[PDB]
Every structure is written in structure tokens, then in C-alpha cells.
Ligand binder design. Sequence first.
Ligand code: GTA
Ligand code: 2TM
Ligand code: MG
Ligand code: MG
Lengths: 726, 717, 358, 103
Amino acid sequence: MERIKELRDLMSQSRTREILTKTTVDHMAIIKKYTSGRQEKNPALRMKWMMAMKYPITADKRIMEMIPERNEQGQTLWSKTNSDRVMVSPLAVTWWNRNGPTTSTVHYPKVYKTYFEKVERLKHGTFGPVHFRNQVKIRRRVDINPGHADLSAKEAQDVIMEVVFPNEVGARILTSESQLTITKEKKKELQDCKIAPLMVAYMLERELVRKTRFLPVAGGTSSVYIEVLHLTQGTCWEQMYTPGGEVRNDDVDQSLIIAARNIVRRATVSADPLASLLEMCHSTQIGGVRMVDILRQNPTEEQAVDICKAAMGLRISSSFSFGGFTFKRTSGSSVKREEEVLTGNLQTLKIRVHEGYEEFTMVGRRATAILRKATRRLIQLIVSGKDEQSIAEAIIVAMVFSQEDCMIKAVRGDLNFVNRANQRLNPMHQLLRHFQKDAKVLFQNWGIEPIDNVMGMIGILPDMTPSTEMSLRGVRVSKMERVVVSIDRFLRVRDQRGNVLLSPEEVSETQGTEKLTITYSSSMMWEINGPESVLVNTYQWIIRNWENVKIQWSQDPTMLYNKMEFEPFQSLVPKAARGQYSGFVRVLFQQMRDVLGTFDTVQIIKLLPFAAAPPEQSRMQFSSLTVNVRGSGMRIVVRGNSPVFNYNKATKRLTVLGKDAGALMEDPDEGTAGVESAVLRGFLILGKENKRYGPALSINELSNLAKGEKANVLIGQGDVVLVMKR
Amino acid sequence: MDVNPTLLFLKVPVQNAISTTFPYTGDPPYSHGTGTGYTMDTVNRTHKYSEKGKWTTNTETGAPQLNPIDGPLPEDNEPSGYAQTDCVLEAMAFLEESHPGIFENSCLETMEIVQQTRVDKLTQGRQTYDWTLNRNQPAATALANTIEVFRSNGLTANESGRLIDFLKDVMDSMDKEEMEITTHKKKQRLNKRSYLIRALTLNTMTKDAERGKLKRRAIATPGMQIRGFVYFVEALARSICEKLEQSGLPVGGNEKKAKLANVVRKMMTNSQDTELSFTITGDNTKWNENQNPRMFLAMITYITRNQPEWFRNVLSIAPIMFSNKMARLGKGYMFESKSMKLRTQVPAEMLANIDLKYFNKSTREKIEKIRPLLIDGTASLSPGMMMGMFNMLSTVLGVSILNLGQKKYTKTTYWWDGLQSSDDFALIVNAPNHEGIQAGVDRFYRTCKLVGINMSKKKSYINRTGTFEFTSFFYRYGFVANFSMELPSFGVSGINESADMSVGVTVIKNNMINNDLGPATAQMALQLFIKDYRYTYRCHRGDTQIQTRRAFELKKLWEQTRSKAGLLVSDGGPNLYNIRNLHIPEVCLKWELMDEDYQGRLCNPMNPFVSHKEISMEYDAVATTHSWIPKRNRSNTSQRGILEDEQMYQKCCNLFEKFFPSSSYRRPVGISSMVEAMVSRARIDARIDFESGRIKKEEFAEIMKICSTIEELRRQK
Amino acid sequence: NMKKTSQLKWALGENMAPEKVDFEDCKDVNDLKQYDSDEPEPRSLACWIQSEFNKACELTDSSWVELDEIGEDVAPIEHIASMRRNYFTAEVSHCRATEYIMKGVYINTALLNASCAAMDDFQLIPMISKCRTKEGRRKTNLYGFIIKGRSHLRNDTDVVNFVSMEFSLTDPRLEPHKWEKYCVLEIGDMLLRTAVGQVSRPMFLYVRTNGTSKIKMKWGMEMRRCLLQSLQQIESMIEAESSVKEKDLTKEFFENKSETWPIGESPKGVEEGSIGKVCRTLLAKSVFNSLYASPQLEGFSAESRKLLLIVQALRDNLEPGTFDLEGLYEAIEECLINDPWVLLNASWFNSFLTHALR
Amino acid sequence: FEITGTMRRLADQSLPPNFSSLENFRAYVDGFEPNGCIEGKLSQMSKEVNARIEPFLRTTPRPLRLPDGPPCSQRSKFLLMDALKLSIEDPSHEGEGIPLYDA
RNA sequence: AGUAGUAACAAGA
RNA sequence: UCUGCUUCUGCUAU
RNA sequence: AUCUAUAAUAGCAGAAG
Ligand SMILES: *O[C@H]1[C@@H](O)[C@H](n2cnc3c(N)ncnc32)O[C@@H]1COP(=O)(O)OP(=O)(O)OP(=O)(O)OC[C@H]1O[C@@H](n2c[n+](C)c3c(=O)[nH]c(N)nc32)[C@H](O)[C@@H]1O
Ligand SMILES: Nc1ccn([C@@H]2O[C@H](COP(=O)(O)CP(=O)(O)OP(=O)(O)O)[C@@H](O)[C@H]2O)c(=O)n1
Ligand SMILES: [Mg+2]
Ligand SMILES: [Mg+2]
């Protein structure tokens, strides 16, 4: 009523009518941003340049009736300006704050509930000690605002639009049941709201919309730990801290899986993996809560979590998760090998392929299925879902799980298998995400076969239609428990019958990052840390204890090789390599103790962790040794410096992965003659090339020489040198 | 003892103390006079690097245009603009061969972008050349002026609201006999050539507040006829850059550091053990002046193969317009007579018909060298990109040259890869010995020469792989922290008291997170920010003696208040911030400690220092009284005729928001006029209200009658 | 407000801007010419700037900065940070460079406020500073006076002229080339105790016309960021060693002084100072960057960073190679024209090269 | 989206030297396949176009050359090491804080 | 004069 | 007749 | 597990090229 009379008043005139008629709604935003003047620039200088003035503030003329022109000292609080605006001093703000009409109904706590949640989390937080340590912060994407657990950012924005502006949503429809529930609750909670709809929308954006950022993180990546990242994680220190509220069960499950995988991987290297594993789970906390107390009350299905539960005499599920479905192997076995495959979009990538026939019960909430499969082959899939969308979900999950070459070749479009920061993504998760948006091509390229119509069931066709004649190549539709276990010294989980149910070999090798901070209390607070931390701390321990380590490396080397301090390192060495590597390094060290004058402290420190394995004999000469860091094999070069281990001869400070490890003092028996006895197995390097002895041959070409014979070898980073066979 | 800070590098590596070498505590250098000198010098350098090219005269503008494409191969190591089209096409072909399907997928996403983008996107620009006024104007103002002139000339496809329809309007405007400019009411008429020269013009200004440079340089801003095409081309190039592992764009910040570290890490992993590995920290010299628009057209034509023809056309228009672009000379010069003690301004438009006696040696040489190109106060500049106008496309070209470094293309024992961010680049070369490294470096340099890329020899260096610099990111076996670069972000921002508190504390916290700001230095930064804040806003602690106009009210409020720890710093309260609570705002930090009456005054729903919206009943305010609005002085020219246009614009937009509640939360869409949309909304709202039962017979009749009256007024003025 | 006398009109440059006329009224003037746009006239490095820097690194008796209060320390990291900050504040509050910081902040603030509040007046601005003596009581200091000229500053590079009269005991006839811009008067005699005996020493007034802009004044009021620039580096070095030691090393660095860093040069050779001396040196360097900000400094810093990195790659035994080393040297030397701070920094770079190559 | 009229002529003049119309250039680009264009252009280019690496040794770098002329002058906005202050041991007077009183 | 440095300020209307 | 383009980050809501 | 993005309100400020 008011507004229509207002509009008629503006249309009665001439220029406003021409504006209202000759301006579409799309151009209204342009004319709304339309500004006249010299714009503005450097407002900090302006603020310093106007706060010394008398009236730097502009307010509405209504303030005449609220703020007096003068206080009890005759200082002017506002001055009329030659319009509805009025120039005002900050003294007016302070006079309102000390004399203005007060009230018991303020909207600040409700509109800004999330900030008060931060306040409450800090108030009830628990502070532990500060530990100064070599910190390895990795840059990754984390949550700055957690948002609603159910909704995504798009869904949260849709909910906000439907709640605040119901008649302006356009063609959009809320599809999810969580969306509808939250919309109902917010519309119920916001009737008779005296706040403007814009600020209500922004309050709901703070409450519901999830927001992420790339940050350098150590410790937990959950939003309750990211909000206090400045307080808990430093350059050289970790502040033990636990937020005050309630933890999300999802984050607890994730961090438990991470800790269990790290613990099992480190335990496999020990000479008594069972006792080692028990000690670690007894000395581990997850978000402030003891790991054993979590393991006694957490129903998480995972291989390493089940191994941890079995070692402490608990009932396990012997099941895992994949694509939202719970998988339980009923019969069969498998091993895991790395296989390079080419996808439908010409992207080559390695997948962990499981060799061996096996059978699974795949339980979802809206679907269920029996699967039988072999090495990259879907032998049989009997799905029993409720709705055809759930049936399609389960079929897609089973085709991806089968690791069929048809599935790998069905990839079309711009499917990336790397992160935006060029980090490796899980290929199976990427294929699942790709086919869950549209699996038309997968259904076409899967294949069809005629049905014999057994048991009354009916098969489904690539068009998601039921057909009694044909179906997919192995797919059939249908109309529709924690066991006591044992565990031995080597972490093999037998059943009550005596057949192996789990093994450390079934534990996923992916090195992930915890959502809640994992706290380890032992001699080495880094023992169950990530690979970069483990490498840095292993070398830092070696050079920090270099006096006793150096005295022991000569008297009883076997005692030194057997130290626990090298076992977190050995879990990063590839298994098949360990023994060989060890043998190599040990032979080097022995031929180093036999040749007087050849003593290189850097070489011993470099190769000492690799000697921690039972040495297997071999005639191979290694120019490098591999350690698995985040899915990639980093090479430590036997001679000289490298990008994972570089000793600066000038500063004398060893650097491992860019993190300083410390300085090496002056060893009197350092070998300045130039001879090297710990680079090649059975060869003393006597210096640079001598053209007398012929051309340079390869490292792996030296096995047919005889003792008392020099040669020129292209051993190193493009360095030709002169060696001789002992 | 003579103190030498540089001697600190004898023990601390230069990277681990790189922050010392950034003197960002002093003021940056500004320009004082005109930019005509830098503009003329830029044009002359661009024509010098391409002087062996072919000269032609433009049949549409009459401007002399230089074409250095396929010119004579360079004979020295001076910068050359003689890019060979076959080498550029080969680089594109091999980039597509090494990443099958990149251009196809990029063109699909860019087709979606081109079909959905609104003309409002153009308003997201800064100061824009406005051909209607022949002056710099805000982007929204320039766009509105362009739309008004186009409409008065019978061009109204932009009414669709799509950017591509406005581009069609621009295309059709470039074919009219005469353009009508209606000022305030003087009716000017540009002809075809004059309008065309104004439409292909980029205004030139001098870049101010720039670190690391002894001498100033010129920047350019294009008009509205260029910006839509450049936006579509840059969107395509961004889609391409997103799919390339060597691109340092459009990733930035922590994500960029992570990508660079991971990519260099993978590169060092791929290099075999027996190989020699070297890294070139490299800059390219005269990057924008040697990026030819014709090569951008060739690249776009190869990228858009087998695409619809409308898409290829709309993507080809930007390189065409940039190939025929004019650079406005600027403000001109100023002349002084000491004996007569007078000074005068000489515009640039009279720099072709002026006597050369007035100028010094170098300026006279500049004018003599540039005079053949002068038309209507602009200079013809066919070669060059005119300062970062195609950052992402030039990034694609550099990445193609990087991609040419695999062993399948070098066909030798050496190979190379690296990182490319527009002009900056990090090149990792691998080879079995030093001669192979030299050969790979020579081959990369000469291949860059073939495509118009000139490696800066004086700014680039090479060392064993492991340390380098890329886009001011210093990598010593990993990227180091450089706190000095973020130093100008500390301080009072000048928004208001609340926002300045929030920004100061948040900046301190984020610098602890990202830039290795230690805890003790963070506490001292907090203390220094609180000092600067209290000085700026005259809000020193109530129980102090500093004398100011505000101090009496602050003392009264202090003595009035039981719980002093609850008062905000802007109210003369204490500073309760520490490392613990940097992430918590100030009103929430001390909400529990506030006195009830002070709390109900600070957060009063009828706060008079913030704006109130009507529902004369108004919504309750939520913000505190420290969220006031600073007076913005905007008062001496003839451009005062737009103040009334803008006032009436604001009146209309507030009325529309009274009719459309979500118009200020999300951008509204619609081809209907404002009055039509508002009347239809009023009608449907009155209908669903009378139906649901909020209004009666008579009010509904009155609303429908006012609507009919407005509709007969819009049809019958 | 000072009366606009003849001497004040001359010293503040009033009516020194030529009349702005149209080109069509003055095109036929014989000496009408383009504005002088010469290269700055070159100057040689004099030994007074190294003495200025040596004095700016000194420890003083008064405390020159009183930092505000922060919340109470609850977390153990906040207690550790408070201890380290006490060491830092002790080092930084008793540095001469901190007195320069406070002096410049006060002067630039007073000048900006005067320029805003009185555009047409010659305001008298005293150079005031506050400190706390070793015994702990507040002390007010007057350095002299500033008269601001007219300050109708349209742009942010527009110059406001002022006259500065500053007390001194330094004889201007000992290093006259330093005082080219000044007219130094003799205004009094001063009685100073040194050990047991006081002498009558002449007290001079250094008077000069100077100028500034709103940008220079804005960057002068924000000079306390120099403290952060130094302290962040100092703490980073502390933290760099703490990670290797797995313990807080603030006390071991500040109290034991077993760790030293090359910070200077003497006839004996390179001299090494404690972490506090390094902190004061970096603070003085940041402060002198702020006081002597120039395009020459920007160019020199940016261009010499590359030579520093090449020398580092050489010390790292990374086989550094160049392409146009002579071009880099030419670009570095293009910035060395007349600014004493940049010339001192270039001399420092030559000394660093000497010590780092051997 | 049609390129017609003035824009067509501008496109006809925005090409490499050996093309007369945008359509001919588009046809050439569509038919283009790489065949030793870069290797041939490299074989043609002179050997004086190169990036020869100069080793940076301990004896390689020379000292920077500082300019010549009269000695530099003081340019600070205030005295630094020659400053003298007249001080009051405690500003405990009337109207404190105002600078003229203290002065 | 001074600021300043490749062109300006040293008020303008 | 005077702060451009691009990218990231932070803050705010005429 | 993903997540500039199975994404798109706008303005200002800092940095980089
Ligand atoms: O966030 C990660 C993880 O913590 C989380 N997760 C894992 N388990 C749970 C549960 N139980 N509840 C909630 N969240 C859970 O999901 C992410 C998975 O970790 P990630 O390292 O990314 O992948 P992972 O290494 O686990 O492998 P993935 O592809 O997810 O497969 C999981 C599981 O499936 C086994 N598997 C796959 N295939 C194709 C198999 C096969 O053919 N034969 C057999 N026997 N097993 C197969 C994988 O080996 C894993 O066991
Ligand atoms: N503000 C900026 C700075 C840079 N750029 C873009 O970055 C390029 C390199 O700038 P640059 O600054 O590295 C060129 P410089 O090293 O000074 O000199 P040289 O060319 O003789 O080598 C420019 O040519 C623009 O494309 C921009 O668009 N805006
Ligand atoms: Mg570079
Ligand atoms: Mg550069």
C-alpha cells in the first residue's frame, strides 16, 4: 500500500519515469553500483586524517532526538550539515554508550551464535604441556567453518534461500530430507523475527554453510582444531590442547582409523609386533581421549582398527567400508599388487589390484548384495535393494569394486586423478565419484547376457528397466555380528575355527591425516608420526646421539642396528627391499671398518637406518635407497647429497626434507685423502677419472672384474670416478 | 666495530633471513607528474623489438601497424618480437598431444561460461576508460554510459542481460555511420573512424606504489568494448591452465606453494640417479611488449578447432581488437617559464602539431620517433599485449614451451620441465653431464626465442637443483617464510572501530598461521596494534591521563562501570586479547564481563549510528554503536551533473528493494523494466494476500487501481 | 599560529609556485621549456652514515616504548611467549633506533594533524618525546620546533614545506658536507658532567627547510612495524635452533651468550655479536629503511637480492652459473646515485662479498 | 555470432603476413599438423643466439662500483645522532599533554 | 629555497 | 584530463 | 574420501606477476 503510492509518486514525475521504464531489472544492478566522484583510496590515511577533526561520522538526522547537541562539558556531539545526513563526533558514540536508553533484549548472542560457540569451546578447553620438536607442517585443505554435517554448501544455500526468501527461490526445489528438516526447524525458529532478512540470511550462512581453505597444518584438521591452529601448532613447538565441546563421532572414527593404521604399520617391523602394538595403543590419545577407551566403545569397521581390537581381546567385525557400503568377506583370500592401467580418458595410473577369488556380503542402508569376484573380474552380483536408484548405486559400487577393465575404460570427460595442488587422489574414490554422477557409458560398455529366469528373480538392463530375457554381464536383482577372535605374535587374526580373518597385509597403505590431534607418549613422541616427521626425527636422533652411536658403530655394530630407534624408519622402506638394503649397507660399513683412513660420518649417518633389517645377501650395487613418502618412492642417493638428505659441507648442518636436523662436529679421523669405502659393495673409490683405464662403464657392469683391478665408473649424479676392486 | 647487517648472511643462509632484504617499512615510490613519457617510451620499445616486421596501414582506422610475425629469425640476444606462427602452432599441437583432450574440455566449459555470463560481470572492474567521456571512470559508470549511448543509437541487444548479447551490440556498434553522444544537453556526433579509434583505445596511466623498481612504468586500462572479449578469452585460458601441472596459475597462496612443492618434488623423483639436475631461476624480459596478439589469435584458433563457429568468433574477437589497438598518450606535459614565473599544461592531443623546441633531448627524440603513429591523441600499437592483459594465455604459451622439453620431443639425452607463471619460470634441466645441461638450456632458450619469449639473462641464474626462486617464493629444499612481504597489512585499517579491531587481531592470527609469526612477536604485534588503535580512535584506557576531546566521556563511562574488564577497547576498556583468543571477536570475548546496562546500550536495537531498514516501523539493529559510518568527503569541476542521476538511481533501487526483498542478498535477474516488475509483484502479492486473508475488499481494489494507474502512466506519459 | 612574516614566507616557500596559465597565452615565451627531468646528481659515500648506523644500534639508558597490556597467560605457550617477549622488550625498548621510531611517529603524526586541521596557517609544532629513565620515572624531551607551511594537499604526493630547528651539541664545522641543507646557528652554552668535571660546550641550532607529503607522513606514523620486522627474524632464528635442540633456547641465547652471529667488522676482522646485538642491528636496519626510503633503495634491494642468492648457491656448493652477470651488476649500480643509506648498503654488500668468497 | 563488416576487415588485417582473410588462416590452422617446423627453424637460427652459462666461482664476482662526486649529505626529516633534548624529569605540571606547555 | 627525481609540488577556483 | 589486468588471502554488509 | 568447483552476491584492504 505504502510502496505502491510511493511508486506512483515517482512515476508522476518525468525523469524517474524514464528511469523506471527504460531500465530493465538486469541493468538495475549496474545503475545501483553507479557511482560519481573521485572514488576513494588508502582509507587508513583518511582515518588518521579525519579522527583529529570535530565530526568524522555521518548519521541519520533521527539522532537529533536521541543524542543531545552538547554534553555536561559543552562539547558538541553533533552539528547540522547543510538533507537527512548529520555530522557526528565519537563523543556521541561514547555518550550513547554511557547514557543511552538501555534494554534487556539484545540480538547479538543469537545473530552471532557461532562466535559464542568458539568462546564456549575455549572456556572449557584443556591445556597440556608444550613440547619443543621438529615440526613438519603440510599444506592441505581444511575446514574453516564446519557448517551443517548433513548439508553441503549448495544445499545449505538452498535451505537459506527457502527459509529467508520463500517466494524468491525460482525453479529450485529442496530435494534432501535433511534439507527439508532443517528448513522446517529454521522457519519455526524464526517466526516473529525482528532482524532484517539480510542479516538473518548471513547468520544462517555462518550456521550452515561449510567453508574450506588451504592452510599449513600440523595435528588435527577438524574445524575445532583449525580454529585454534595459531595456538596449538608453532614452528618448533606443539601445545597440547583439547577443545571444550562435544566431538563429532565421524572425526573420532577417522582419527582412530589413522592412528590404528600407523600403529599396525610400525608394529609389523618390530621383533614382537603384538607387544609393540599393545604398548602403542596404551600410549596413544585421540583428541584427548585414551585410545584404549575409544577402542572399547567404538563400532568402526576397518582392518587395522579390528587388529587393534583383537590384540586387546575384543570382538571385531572383520569387515570394512567401500563406497558407502559395508563389505564382509565370507570366503576366499587375496593379495595386493600395484598395477598400471590406462583409463578411458587416456590417464595412466596405478591401482592396488587384489589377486584371488573372494566373496562378499555388501550391506547398505537402502540396498544389499552378494558379490563374488576374481582378479579384476566381477563374477557374480546379486543385488537386493529397495528402490531402483539404490539398486543402481549398489551396481555402480560393485562394478568399481570389481576393478574391471571395462570400468576403467568407461571413463569419459575431464576426470582428474590429482588434486588442485597436484596431490595424488585415491583412484578408486575418483572412479566412484565419476560414475556416481552419471554411469551411462559404464552401463553401455559393461555388457549383456540372456537370463534363464531362475528362482523367480529378474535381471536389469543398462536402461535401468527390469527384463526377464537379458541383463548385465553377471548382475541379478532380487526381492528383499561381532565374532570372538584370536591373534598371535605376528598380528594374524584367527577365528574360533582356526582360519585367518585378518592380517597386517590387509591394512591400507595410504598415509592419511587425522581429524583430531593424535598424542603419543613415549621415548620417541614421533614414533607413530607421518613419514616426513619420521625421517627428520630419525636422522635428528642419530646425530643428536652421535657420540655413543659412533662409539657403538665400531665396537658392537649388531647392537646398534637392533635399536628400536630405527624401526619407525624401517616401516617406510618397501618390504621386499628391506633385507637387500640392509645387507648392502652392512657390507659397506664392514668394508669401512677395514680400510683405515676412510671414515665419513655423513655416510654412516645416511645409511644407518637402512641397516636395521635382517640382512639378505645380494650382489646388487645400489646407487640409491627408496623410502615410501605419501605414496611416492623418494630416493636417498648412496654417494653425495640428494633432495631427501643433503649435508651442507659449509654450514655442517644436515637438512632432511628441508627441515634442519643439526650440525656435525669435526671428527679428527675424517678422511681427507679423498678415498670412499661406503659407496659401492666391494669397491674403493680412489678419486677422479683416469683415462688410462678405458671408458666409463655402468654401476651394474662392475660384477665381472677381478681383485687388484682399477676402472672408471659413472657412479653418482653424472660423476665419473676411479674405483678399484678389493 | 662497524655494524654490517649483511654479514649476518655469513652464518644464516640468505633464504632463512630473506625477510631482512625486503625494506617494506618505508613508503613505496609514487609518480608525481604525467605518464606520457612512459607511454611513448613503451610504444617505442615495442616498435623497436619488432622493427624488422612489415608495415601496413589499417583500412578502418588509418593507423600504421607493425607485423613482426614470421619475420627474420633473430641474430643476437636482444629482445625480439619475431614469433614464428608454425612454431606456436607446433607448441599448441604438442601440448594437446601430451594432454589429450585438454582443449576440447576447456572449450566445453568455456561454452557454458560464455552462454551463462551476465553483462553485470563487467562491473567487477576498477577504473575503466570511458569513450563516452574520453576519461577514466568507475567500471559500472562506464558500462552504464556505454549502455545508454548504445540504446540512444538503437542498439538494444544487451537488454537480454547476457554478456554475449552486449558483445553483439558492440559488434554492431562498430558498423554505424555515426555515434550520438548526449551530454549535459550538448549533442556530439562521432563518425565511424573516430568512434572506432575510441573503441580500440586503452587509456594509459603510471603505476603507483610499486616496490622493487627504481624507475616508473606505464599501465593500461581498456574500454568496455574490449573487456567482455578479454574476459571470455581469459576464461578459456584459465580453464586450460587449471589442467596443466606446470602452471603457477590460477593457484595462489598456500595452494600455489603446495602445488609448486609437489610438482618440483615429482620432477626430482622422475630424474634418474645417474643424471645431472640443474634449476634455472628465470625471468622473461619485456614480456607484454613481445606477446603478439596475432599469436594469441593463432593459439585460440588451434584451441577451438572443431568447435561451433559462433564460439570461435566470440573467442577470436579479443586478439583482433588487440591487434588493432590504440594507446592513449595520457595527460601530456607541463611547461614552466622561470623568467615569467608561469606554468602551463600541454595536452597530449597536441603532441603531433607542436614545436620541438620546448622539449629536452630525450623527450624530443621520443616525440620524433612516435609521431608517425599519432591519431586523435593516441598512438598505434599493433605489437605487444599492453601490460598483463592476457596473463593466462601467455602462461599457456610458456607452459607449451615447457612441455616441449620431454625426451619424446628433445630426442636427446637431456630434457627439461618446470613451472610457469605468466612470465616467471623455474626450469629444471636434466642431462648425463654438464655439456648436456648447456645444450638443453640453449635449446630451451632458442625455442623460446622462436615463439617471442626472451629469457632475461641478467635476472636469471642456474644452480644444482634444490634451491630456486619463483614468484617471490624462495625455495631452499622447501619454501621458507617471508614475513616482511605481509608487513604493510599490519595496522589500523580505517573502516571503523569494530572492523579495525577485527582486522588487526585476525591479521596477527593469520600471520602466526601462515608466515611463521612467533608467539612472543605475536604478543608484541598485539600490543603495538592496540597502541596504534587507541591513538587513532582516541580511546585510551579510561584510567589514564592522555588528553583528548573524547577523554571526558571515556572517564565518565569508566567511573560509571562496575566491571571494567567488559568495556570494549573503543570504550576505554582493557585489552584482554592473547594468543589463546585471537580467533574470537571482541564483543563476544567480553560479553560475560559486561555490565547489563552498558551491554544493553552498546547493542541497543535502535542504534542510531547504523542504517535501519523498514519492514514507520523498522527492523532491530544488531551491530554495536562502534560500527558507525565515516563521513566521505566528495566535494570543483563540471562533473556535478551525475550527482542527481545517481540520487534518483538510488531512490529507484530502494523502491525496488521495497518491492523485492532478496534483491540485495542475491543479484536479481530479468528483462522486464523496473516499473513492470514492481507492478506485477504488487499485483500478485495483493492477490495472494487477499486470498490468504491479510487484506480486505477495499484495500485490494485500491491496490489494483493504483497499479492500473501506474500502468496507464507508463504506457501514456 | 606564527605570524606570516617575510622570513617565514621565504623559508616555507610561499608564492614559489608559478602561476598556472593557458598554453595559448604563453606559447611565445623565450624560455618556456619542459620541466627539468634530469637524473639525480651523483654523490659519494661519506663516513657519517656508518657512524649514524653504529649509533642507532646502541643500547640506551631510558626506555623508549611503553607497550600496552595483554590478557593473562593461561596456556603454557603463552607463558613461554611472555618470557621471550620480556627478553625482546628489554632488548628493543632500550635501543636508540626505538627512540628514532618514537620521534618519527610523533613528528609525522603532529605534521599530519596540523596539515589537516590548519591548511592556511603556519603552525608551531614542538618536537616532543616521552621516555622512562633507568630509575623508572617518566621524562619529557624537547628536540626543537617545526613550523608547518601551507598544506593545501590535493594529491597524496603534494609537498607541505616546513622549517625544522633542532638543538644539538655537534659542531657543524667538523663534517660540513653532511650539513649542506642546514644553516647552523650558535644559540647557547651548556654545562655537562662527564666523569667529575664539567665544561662549557657550545649549543647549536640546526635550522633547515624540509618537505613531506601525506604518503611520507602516513608511512612515518606507522614506523613501529620496524620492531616486528626485526623481532620476527630474531625469534625465527631462536626457533630454528629450538627445533634442533627440542627445547626453548631463549634463555640460553640471551643470558649465556654462547651463540653469536657475525654482525660487524673491525680491523681484526669479522666481529660476532649476541642475539640481542643482532636484534638491535636488524631493528636499526628497518628503522633506517623507514627514514631513508627512496626508489634507489627499492631498486638496490630487489636487484641485489639476486646476487645474494647466487653467492648463497656458491656457498652451498650448488655450482651457480650466470648468463649476464655484468648486466646484473649494471642494474645494481644503476640504483646507486646519491642516497647515503643505499650507498652504505652497497658498501656493506662489498664487505659481505669480501668475507664470503674467501 | 557473426564477424561482419568492420570487424571482418579488422580480422582480415589481424593475421600473419602471408594470409589475406581470417577464413584462409582458419583453414590453414585446421589443416595444420606438426612436421619439423621447430627443428627447422632452430637449424636456421644463428649460433650467436644462445644462453651460454658463465660459471660463478669464488674469484668471479667483483665489488660494486659506487658513484663519484661530492660526499653525500644528511636528508633525514630530523636529527638522529646529533640530536640534543631539553628534558623535564617528570611532566607533573598543569595542563599536561598539550605540547606547547611541555615545550 | 626546499621536497624531490626522468615530473611534479612549491595551492586552486 | 591521474591506482590497470590477473591470482590468492583477509575483513565487512547500502 | 572429495572439496577454486558436482561451485558462482558484492565491496574494500594486503601481496604477487
Ligand atoms: O577417510 C578414509 C578412511 O579413514 C575412511 N573410512 C575407512 N573406513 C571407514 C569406516 N569404516 N567408517 C567411516 N570411514 C571410514 O574412508 C577413507 C578411506 O581411506 P583411503 O586411504 O582413502 O582408502 P583405502 O586405503 O581405505 O582404500 P579404499 O579404496 O577406500 O578401499 C577401502 C577398503 O576396500 C578394500 N578393497 C577394495 N577393493 C577393490 C578390494 C578388493 O577387490 N578385494 C578386497 N579384499 N578388498 C578390497 C580396500 O583394500 C580397503 O580394505
Ligand atoms: N604491476 C604489474 C607487474 C607485472 N605485470 C605483468 O607481469 C609482466 C612482468 O612484469 P615485471 O614487473 O616482472 C617486468 P620487469 O622485471 O620490471 O622488467 P623487464 O620487462 O624489462 O624484465 C608484465 O609485462 C605484465 O604482463 C602486470 O601486469 N602488472
Ligand atoms: Mg623469475
Ligand atoms: Mg621481473
